[PDB]
Design a protein. Structure first.
Lengths: 387, 387, 387, 388
């Protein structure tokens, strides 16, 4: 037996201190490391390049994703930035999803306008749209599945093998499910990346990113570029993230129980026009999600009856969903993407993503199921009183 | 509606930052707080007396335990110390259990030798022993249930009512189960205390204590003595401890799933002489534990067949159980009470308690059941190979 | 040759990490440490008993003070508390100074009322008072020099030799000057203790304490009691405190430059009635301070002309002196001891000490002399404009 | 009056907590902040974009440098990365110094090979080399003065006014002196940047960067680009960095006293061929440094008599100088740039910078001067023993 995912996350850095046998791993804040006398670099020399505390988190995310190594960055956007710098140069074309996170769109459109690469935004749920993009010989394809905030599911085996036939690398943003629930590298992706800010840290008190490469040579290109660009993260942040990771399995058990229950409430409720949640049998992509994921996760969005006034009445009064950005915390959250998470997009790119001005997104926490439903039901009455 | 205990713990100090609306509470390390002009103390003035980060943890443990307030100490022994100093003076008698934590035994016995109080050490699970202790008019009775490390169960309602009949205060050490699995104040106790070092924190990276009093007058007295003796904990530690608390309900589900599966493997295994786990119907205290606890927890101890050779072969080779003191963490631990946790006791006090030299204690973490069971089976073999 | 005090403090735990050669020492938060197989304790086992980050700070304060070792407590009051429990039992007598810190007065008086020891409160600067206290065969004499807040100076060599003649142990509270400015163990004292909250830390972001013993056997006793009472500090706090120590010598140069410039402005200013600063030749204790101290420090207090209205006009408007408790930070502070630092005292104990109701105490930080002097001059006019 | 530099750094974030009046500022680790009800962003929304604890450090460095605002990044190299991204695009030319930090060189050469900008590497101490480079109409000139590790001084008024005449922006890497000792924005620079890893933090336990812009609009472009690229720093690092900043003045007083003493020992010692230290009267740029800086700093390098054997003997046995990378700490350090800090450069870029294979670089700490000199003298004995 190698261990399971859960054991590996729990034991990450446990009993791995050669100095004192501390059970919990020491925080190495040091910027620098001594040489072992003249000409003799130790394993570490300088934290920007390499840090033992940061590398425990890289090693654990690599073990969980099945890759050769991991690079930990100061932010999620910083992981995406790392991949774009290590892989693309001018004259290269990048294919991105139409409904990627608004911050990814912002970065892709900014760097493309400078000429750092050419940009094709496509619908990867959609074989025609994918084949028109792959006919242009892209260096790189990015997949974000399930997608933020409409939970569109893209067929990892389909898109990754279509892109291999034309010689493109693949990178998957696996933020929304974590490595506990989806392993894109199992499907042949070259790279998997995360905002550790979300479920991997789980406590809404670190911003971070990670990139795991399947192949040892691409891992070393990422290490080199991270060091050179100074995109690497703080050892203290890596300490809190590794601490968070140890409860990832236990947290997701509750996130998913709570989300199955809230999906049941919102599906078919009189005051709800549409629910987007991969666990619903009627959601386009349900069968795909069931085969490529080990769970349906705990992100969902939904559209209320009754326009702006219903949205305002629903949101103002929530006791247990904080109105705020981010997701993946132990604490439940709610967001209005048009005006918050996806406000960096133009009204046109939103229209093309199918993100309406009335869409609410839930990040379902690990509070008691009974309390989240009392809160959501009172919300739905407040919105009904509006008609 | 009030929220459940689990909701309260997940959301303690969420969106309670008047400065910026931070979702996660800011860490207030400051030793000191400005006055609001001459004569105008704010809410806080000095961190030894009171600090807001520490008070979030205080207010959270008091909500969970049903008390008027909570005091956070540098350590668990510190929380016991605070209670002895606030409640007892020379000529007062204290009744303690015979099978309490060895460190509790060391402190009671050192402060009794100096004459801070008179000490009676009784078996609180046996009525004759209890009645003889209560007939000597004690100021304070301490209960520790379940007991470390034999998991003896003492009848909270019985002992507390019996102690009120003679004017004694009662304090319960509730470390082994946390507030999520046992609420002694519900049964009339005046004081409950914890080593927060264990389940409450959950990440083996903070030593700390807490005392919660039912009554506001007794809470104001503990606040005064904690400030005067200098027993209060660090704000950074409260911060990590509070972060720990948010996953307590989530952690204990997996803890209890794993402990049930491990009790079943150990009980009537040929190499296992006795299992002490209150979840087994054959354990003296099982039905009392099913009544006064929400669950049977994840601490257990066992005797192997085959003397000291068998213990050694069992322990050397464990991959997933670290040989170490402490308990209540996400990572699985094993200890040998006689030489480790209860080394502070004399050989006669261990014999009176029923702690043999062949006893092993397990703290069962939240790794996969299957990896822990493979690890224990390999150990039982190595013990068998010794005969 | 050995290095100086300053070199030792700057380099405490620099290049002393066997794991990675980290230049700065790693933070060991871990509550627990693995055994090296069955029966083999490593150097550390449990953080309440010993922790390597806390021991760098202990070992550093013991080098600076000339001691056999040091113990780091959660607070300064906790270090006094540790010494009272390690050294005293009922029937023993303790001699304390009349103008000790009000928090010391609160603890001595509360533990004396319970009868943990008998208390003699003497004026240690006056030989009759000292002789009458030493004629009563005390187990322990506590000296606080200079005294908070009137900067009375007690003759370390005289009092210590007098206490040895009658078999008493001596403990000195060396908080106001730190080890960089006064070394009581050089004059034969048994114990020196500190509030690390002040100059040692220097950044007003840690409450902590330290006790250093001259003799190895008394150090082993303080280690034992600190573990058994649970009085030990947080490793995170020891890390910030060690980081503070590194600039102690550099900080005190500027503190003393600023204090000299400010004592000169206040002494025979028309609005100032008395200055208490041991650096002035007119201060009872100046020549003793010049002999037993490397410098006059940066604490001072003063009485304004014009009663309560003048104090209020002086305090309300200060830009660079914050109205707060504590002292010894980089930032300048002002306090009113009667209502703030020494409110724990009765009005009668304050009168016996010579703490009037019109007294102000300054902690002078490391801001520019010119910005502090402009700030004080403006206060002196506001106080003038009151008459 | 407004306050001095020392007062500003000491009082940064002091008594600035509206929640409890904490004297020392709270650490806001929170990734997110609540909205004030539907449609109502508060001052902060998301730490990657902006965080109050990080903003105290940005504000304080902006006050110290005289600029409109500051952006704090996860590293020093990340600050340089932020500037190249916010200011340059393909077809733009960037002028850099020949003797810049080998990490800067690595990044300039890597991004120039991809085509992100055209690169001109010039000697900015040398007026013909500067004027050949400004004839090429560059978007941006970077100055690193004093330079790492030969302490070459570049004339801020000269180079910045030459670059304004041809329409180029100026950015100055001011790591080596800190804002306490050189204010490039006083000389007209558009941008100053720092590795806060060095003197600003001072305690070797944070990697960090900062960029301060003179102009509000360029600060707003930096905030935007830092958010979009995800270059922003951790709030906990910004907390430790602000804590170190509070002792910057007091640390530099001892750094400079110790460096004057060590310069005096090495200058004209029989075992020392060359010392590079701006505070020596015989160092090229001494009068320029005396004028454009408020002190000569505590960085120096030097070349020993006696080849590789002398270097190996000097270094092995130092009790108080740790052999390691970085600088600006309270703890004294020694580095061999060819094989450590400048190993990222090619042997030709080093030869062009004048960084020989025998150069040792001292970062002088705040230990007792008497101890640092006992250590250096024993080292010079050890290298002497190597001839005979
Ligand atoms: C699939 C995916 N990949 C990557 C990322 C980036 O990870 P980070 O860098 O944040 O750690 C995210 C983040 N998502 C957050 C972002 C909040 S909006 C940002 C802010 N106002 C801004 O203007 O930017 C969310 O949707 O709630 C992400 O959902
Ligand atoms: C029921 C109870 N109440 C209180 C406490 C005290 O709480 P803390 O102070 O540790 O946070 C504990 C601790 N128990 C731990 C620690 C053993 S450490 C031995 C050490 N070498 C020493 O000499 O002490 C255990 O059995 O593993 C406790 O089980
Ligand atoms: C010479 C000495 N020894 C010991 C100590 C104790 O050290 P700490 O425990 O604080 O670290 C001090 C502290 N002195 C501070 C604290 C005043 S706090 C009043 C507070 N509300 C309370 O009720 O206490 C001062 O005068 O400013 C001390 O001057
Ligand atoms: C003037 C200047 N600007 C910027 C920076 C960059 O700042 P940081 O990102 O490190 O904070 C520096 C750094 N200087 C360090 C770097 C050590 S080498 C690093 C490593 N092995 C690698 O391969 O990179 C030094 O010379 O000792 C710098 O001197």
């Amino acid at each position: 037996t190698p261990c399971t995912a859960a054991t590996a996350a729990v034991r990450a850095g446990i009993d791995r201190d050669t100095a004192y046998g501390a059970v919990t791993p020491p925080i190495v804040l040091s910027s620098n490391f001594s040489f072992d006398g003249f000409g003799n670099k130790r394993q570490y020399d300088y934290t920007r390049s390499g840090n033992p505390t940061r590398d425990l988190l890289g090693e654990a995310l690599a073990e969980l994703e099945g890759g050769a190594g991991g690079v930990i960055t100061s932010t999620g956007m910083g992981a995406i930035n790392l991949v774009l710098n290590a892989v693309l140069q001018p004259g290269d074309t990048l294919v991105v999803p139409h409904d990627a996170y608004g911050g990814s769109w912002r970065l892709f459109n900014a760097l493309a306008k400078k000429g750092h690469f050419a940009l094709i935004t496509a619908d990867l749920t959609d074989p025609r749209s994918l084949a028109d993009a792959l006919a242009q010989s892209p260096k790189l394809v990015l997949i974000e599945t399930p997608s933020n905030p409409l939970l569109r599911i893209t067929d990892l085996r389909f898109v990754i093998e279509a892109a291999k036939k034309v010689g493109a690398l693949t990178v998957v943003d696996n933020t929304f499910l974590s490595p506990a629930l989806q392993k894109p590298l199992d499907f042949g992706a070259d790279l998997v990346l995360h905002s550790t800010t979300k479920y991997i840290n789980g406590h809404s008190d670190v911003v971070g990113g990670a990139v795991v490469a399947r192949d040892a040579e691409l891992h070393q290109q990422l290490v080199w570029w991270a060091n050179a660009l100074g995109l690497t993260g703080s050892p203290f942040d890596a300490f809190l993230t590794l601490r968070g990771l140890r409860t990832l399995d236990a947290r997701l058990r509750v996130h998913q129980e709570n989300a199955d229950a809230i999906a049941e409430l919102l599906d078919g409720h009189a005051m709800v026009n549409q629910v987007y949640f991969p666990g619903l049998a009627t959601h386009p992509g349900h069968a795909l999600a069931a085969r490529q994921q080990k769970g349906f996760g705990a992100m969902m969005s939904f559209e209320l009856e009754g326009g702006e006034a219903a949205v305002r009445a629903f949101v103002d009064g929530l006791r247990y969903f904080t109105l705020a950005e981010s997701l993946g915390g132990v604490e439940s959250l709610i967001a209005h993407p048009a005006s918050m998470t996806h406000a960096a997009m133009t009204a046109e790119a939103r229209a093309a993503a199918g993100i309406s001005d009335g869409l609410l997104r839930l990040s379902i926490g690990i509070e008691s199921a009974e309390d989240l439903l009392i809160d959501l039901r009172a919300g739905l009455s407040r919105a009904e009183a509006t008609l």
